[PDB]
């Protein structure tokens, strides 16, 4: 037998990778970053975060950065969550802008 439809574990490895657009709204109103990210969907939050820095790769200060769910309306917080966990796909769009600190 052995089918990956059971709960998962035995089920889902990786294989659906789908590119996600990031755009990237600088918190200077300097000019928006469109980066495209190829993601499987077990990635968790805070890694994407790192690829948007290293994608620009740009000499400034990012204080504090993060995800805006444009469609949520909601700073990605829960970078322990994968992004099927929190439930942000290809379907949505994402902007990363740093939340500016306080």
């Not at 950065?65 to 796909?89: F, I, M, N, P, S």
């Amino acid at each position: 037998g052995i089918d990956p439809f059971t709960m998962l574990s035995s089920g889902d490895l990786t294989s659906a990778s789908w590119e996600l657009v990031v755009r990237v709204d600088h918190a200077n109103g300097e000019q928006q970053t469109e980066i495209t990210l190829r993601v499987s969907g077990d990635l968790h939050i805070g890694g994407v975060m790192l690829k948007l820095v290293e994608q620009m790769n740009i000499a400034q200060d990012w204080s504090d950065y993060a995800l805006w769910w444009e469609q949520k309306r909601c700073w990605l917080l829960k970078t322990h969550w994968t992004l099927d966990k929190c439930g942000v796909q290809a379907d949505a769009n994402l902007l990363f802008t740093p939340q500016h600190k306080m």
